[PDB]
């Protein structure tokens, strides 16, 4: 029987690449999405065309709220409902925007930025564990988490919190044989709204090839961590950044 | 005289920080949540030394719809009492386990992430907005990358606080506001902890096989806010007697 | 045409497993050794039985000395003489023994421990680059920041190796040479160590209460040299079953 | 009786400022130097004029060689010979120059860069401990050690090794009450001879004030670490870098 994976924020970009690569490796996949319904359904259709009944979509807002635990429990439930098992969880979904220190309320910003990047991964981890082979969790971290961008304090706090979860959960879930690791991009796919000139500004900072990571390159590290080739690895965060984090001012 | 806000200052480490700042010549806002009696008792002692140099301020620092207003009011209380706010010490902290496998989990999120991360963020915002030797000191955790079993939310909150310390150091540098951390390993043990368990944890510390006193933690805070640290920002000083260096 | 790799200290244990997995992946290999001639030759014979003319041995002391640069240049040269190319360098050879702060002279200990763990990797890196999916993998130490009592020189060597890995990643990126590390926690324990002592160390590992096999360490090396890691440079992957996360 | 301190490379720049501040705090000082004889003697004169018999010079090359242990032992011996005690050791002396990967031989570069930055501090630590209150050692580290500069691999390796020594010696010497800490500058006052354009280039990178640290600001952190206000601090490395290490590419 084929193993099954949940990938959050899987409709496009890095999340899609991860879902595709897992699917190509033989996983059945839950494609979680928030707003990108057309893209999610389009991906599920492609994957099911390749192998029937091996992909489903699952909609959920991962903003923090008093119902977030129920929503996270339901994402895990959706994997068991579809495939009867859940072997891998990839925490990929992420809100990302600036929150300067000097029309959303600050509390909405906290709920969205900390909810998606940290609290939802935490609750999904709880639900994944509670429900339980080669079991693992992979968290999409940030290679630049200790060289923060100006005006992004809440996002940065969320990604730092995610490092803490990765390490705490690796230790706490080790007795159950659930490995917990991270993949940390530096610069990969740039924002859709970013102009080419600005994209090039950021690309030129990367020592290895002066280019951003392809979505496939990020997915490659995820696939490694979930594989039997990483069976002794837990609590590790692999930078996939072309050396970007090593570059001084 | 300069003025400082210390959160969770009624007892233990926060109290020692408030006392040392006061002894150094600061006027102090003693923030508290439940420890009203102790907060006022401290204010009384400091005011006995120098009249009208200490005030108290009550606030719950749990995350909620009203937290930003609460944090704005803490900073405001310093300006009201003293006409200035030079130093913010984020010391208040909720601390208890949250296993992965009668508070709901979301209440625990609100308390643990609120006190340790969101409130420091909002207080930092309010401190900066209102603005010499200005600085913020965040009480971090030397053991943040060697987590205790079953403490994921607390750990996530302290990791978030590292992110805030570094982010705010960079963002507030143009305003001349330094942002640093002090990271205890083991200092004052929980009051509910048995003496036998206290000894177990004490014996792990290479330097002297004992916990830090509150005063020793306060000493590093005093250094960071002082003129002797005026080029230091974004630094987190471990005050842990080597604890973080000890392998399993 | 098949790529070629140099693996230092490849006769036994982790180096041997790396050389075997590289060969299984399709590499021709230079098996470097110091004292273990018989084991190096038996490995070469094994690999050559699998595929003719795909393995050679190279003897060298990697202790620091005035002849070390020539020795390291000769190791890289041996790969070119055998195979016409050198795609991968694995810095695995390592002296390991305590050097307390309080019959070898201390300068000999410096030469051996710092030579094998840091200076030889540096010189081999120079020679590798000078001759140029190219990459270098350095065998680091997941416990490098939780040092063992009385192992300061070894620890210094491995800390220097982190610096090399990062410096070389940046400096060699323009040539498309990636430079990464694999960091074991506890792997292959010495056969002669008492099982009662082995078990003491095993019990410390969260994941499985067991040391890593040499093959498990080798698996991370294989990933790092593969097409699946072509954007990864300057990264050090812990393969430690969570050991480095465990507090005192 | 006044305590005594050894400061290596104390004739100029940061080491000089450390020596001056220790002396002002009440320490008797061994001013070690290599080439800067006139400056070392002039400093000793300045300090002795303030308080007679409280400063001596000690010349030594700290390049690695088979006699380096003897030279390091002799530096510590010189403190006991002058002052009858040795309470503080500051490892400040350091060779610094590029060593590209692609007139000195490479083994000479290894000897100088690794010797001064790592092996001499190790040997001095050994001798300091062996010859033994508020005892401590302070190592001058590099705030940028994990964001290396192009072509400085040996300097970087030396400073990385120094981090290892700081942590290793903190644990190993804890039972003897000797604390071992670090101070990590980013950029400190640049040579007046460096070009105006290049000085501006490096100064402008510093978030806090867009300027380098003074030598005195670096010394201030050393003074704190050796003081009674740091009695529980061991194995800590305090960055004094104006935020430099936090700045991304
Ligand atoms: N791209 C990079 O250069 C880079 C760098 C460092 C780290 N990372 C990390 O790598 C991961 C993938 O990066 P990416 O650029 O592909 O991500 P992304 O496009 O910015 O976001 C991924 C998905 O997150 C989902 N999401 C946003 N808010 C949500 C909410 N409130 N509830 C539920 N889902 C929500 C969105 O789903 P819908 O579209 O369905 O609404 C979105 O498609 C992220 O965790 C990111 O932080 C990326
Ligand atoms: N003690 C250690 O060994 C150690 C180790 C590592 C880090 N630290 C950190 O160092 C700091 C001081 O430690 P400590 O042991 O003195 O702290 P603590 O006693 O655990 O907590 C300090 C104060 O935080 C306040 N607090 C708790 N929940 C709050 C809430 N919801 N809203 C507002 N305030 C709240 C409390 O104020 P009231 O009493 O007025 O209710 C409490 O007295 C903390 O940030 C801690 O995380 C301590
Ligand atoms: N095993 C672990 O749990 C562990 C943990 C952390 C890090 N590591 C690192 O991982 C790597 C592999 O570990 P391991 O246990 O397999 O290593 P190892 O057995 O200690 O050493 C591997 C080889 O290094 C060679 N070597 C020693 N001194 C040399 C010298 N002066 N000149 C040239 N070669 C010399 C020896 O070759 P000959 O036999 O031919 O003389 C030896 O077989 C090492 O770099 C080690 O430091 C291992
Ligand atoms: N300045 C910065 O921005 C910065 C940044 C990061 C780290 N650091 C570190 O902080 C410390 C102080 O910085 P600095 O700029 O004042 O240092 P520096 O001027 O580069 O070096 C200090 C002294 O080291 C001595 N030295 C050099 N080679 C020696 C050898 N072979 N044997 C014995 N002594 C030798 C020299 O003494 P003589 O003059 O007597 O020959 C020199 O004056 C150094 O360890 C440095 O690496 C400084
Ligand atoms: N990795 C990362 N974290 C970020 C947080 C806020 C804004 C951008 C962020 N990035 C992408 C990034 C950061 C720094 C640099 Cl120099 C580059 Cl080229 C890309
Ligand atoms: N510093 C610290 N962070 C903690 C998080 C959860 C529970 C306890 C925590 N401590 C105190 C602590 C942690 C590990 C050890 Cl070995 C010791 Cl003596 C004290
Ligand atoms: N990884 C590692 N580095 C060491 C340096 C000196 C002696 C042993 C070393 N090890 C193996 C090790 C270190 C700490 C622990 Cl708790 C375990 Cl189980 C294994
Ligand atoms: N020793 C030395 N040579 C220098 C040349 C140009 C600028 C500064 C010089 N220094 C002092 C020094 C030594 C090490 C570092 Cl890392 C730094 Cl920023 C400065
Ligand atoms: N701190 C430091 N380490 C260095 C090593 C080699 C050359 C210069 C070094 N510096 C000074 C430095 C490094 C990076 C930046 Cl962006 C700056 Cl303004 C200064």
TrEMBL record, chains A, D:
NADP(+) binds at residues 12-14, 34-36, 61-63, 92, 94, 155, 159, 186, 188-189. The active site is at residues 142, 155. The modification Cysteine sulfenic acid (-SOH) is found at residues 58, 72, 149. InterPro entries: NAD(P)-bd_dom_sf, Pteridine_reductase, Sc_DH/Rdtase_CS, SDR_fam. Keywords: Nucleotide-binding, Oxidoreductase. One of its GO terms (molecular function) is nucleotide binding. It holds the Pfam family adh_short_C2. Gene3D superfamilies: NAD(P)-binding Rossmann-like Domain. Substrate binds at residue 136. NADPH binds at residues 13-14, 34-36, 61-63, 92, 94, 155, 159, 188-189. The keyword Phosphoprotein does not apply. PANTHER family: OXIDOREDUCTASE, SHORT-CHAIN DEHYDROGENASE/REDUCTASE FAMILY (AFU_ORTHOLOGUE AFUA_5G02870), SHORT-CHAIN DEHYDROGENASE_REDUCTASE FAMILY PROTEIN. NCBIfam families: pter_reduc_Leis (TIGR02685). Belongs to the short-chain dehydrogenases/reductases (SDR) family. This is Pteridine reductase. The gene is PTR1.
Automatic annotation (TrEMBL), chain B:
Substrate binds at residue 135. SUPFAM superfamilies: NAD(P)-binding Rossmann-fold domains. NADP(+) binds at residues 11-13, 33-35, 60-62, 91, 93, 154, 158, 185, 187-188. Keywords: Nucleotide-binding, Oxidoreductase. CDD domains: PR_SDR_c. The active site is at 141 (proton donor/acceptor), 154 (proton donor/acceptor), 154 (proton acceptor). The keyword Oxidoreductase applies. NADPH binds at residues 12-13, 33-35, 60-62, 91, 93, 154, 158, 187-188. PROSITE patterns: ADH_SHORT. One of its GO terms (molecular function) is nucleotide binding. It holds the Pfam family adh_short_C2. The modification Cysteine sulfenic acid (-SOH) is found at residues 57, 71, 148. Belongs to the short-chain dehydrogenases/reductases (SDR) family. This is Pteridine reductase. The gene is PTR1.
């Amino acid at each position: 029987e084929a193993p099954a994976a949940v990938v959050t924020g899987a409709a496009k970009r890095i999340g899609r690449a991860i879902a595709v690569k897992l699917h190509q490796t033989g996983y059945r996949v839950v494609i979680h999405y928030h707003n990108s319904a057309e893209a999610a359904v389009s991906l599920a259709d492609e994957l099911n065309k390749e192998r029937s009944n091996t992909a489903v979509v699952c909609q959920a807002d991962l903003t923090n709220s008093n119902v977030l635990p129920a929503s996270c429990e339901e994402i895990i439930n959706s994997c068991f409902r579809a495939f009867g098992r859940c072997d891998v969880l990839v925490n990929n979904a992420s809100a990302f925007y600036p929150t300067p220190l000097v029309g959303k309320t600050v509390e909405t910003q906290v709920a969205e930025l900390i909810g998606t990047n940290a609290i939802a991964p935490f609750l999904l981890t709880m639900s994944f564990a509670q429900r339980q082979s080669n079991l693992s969790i992979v968290n999409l971290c940030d290679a630049m988490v200790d060289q923060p961008c100006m005006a992004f304090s809440l996002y940065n706090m969320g990604k730092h919190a995610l490092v803490g979860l990765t390490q705490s959960a690796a230790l706490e879930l080790a007795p159950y044989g659930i490995r917990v690791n991270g993949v940390a991009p530096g610069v990969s796919l740039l924002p859709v709204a970013m102009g080419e000139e600005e994209k090039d500004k950021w690309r030129r900072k990367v020592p290895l090839g002066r280019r951003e990571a392809s979505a496939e390159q990020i997915a490659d590290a995820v696939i490694f961590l979930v594989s039997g080739s990483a069976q002794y690895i837990t609590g590790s965060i692999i930078k996939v950044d072309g050396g970007l984090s090593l570059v001084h001012a």
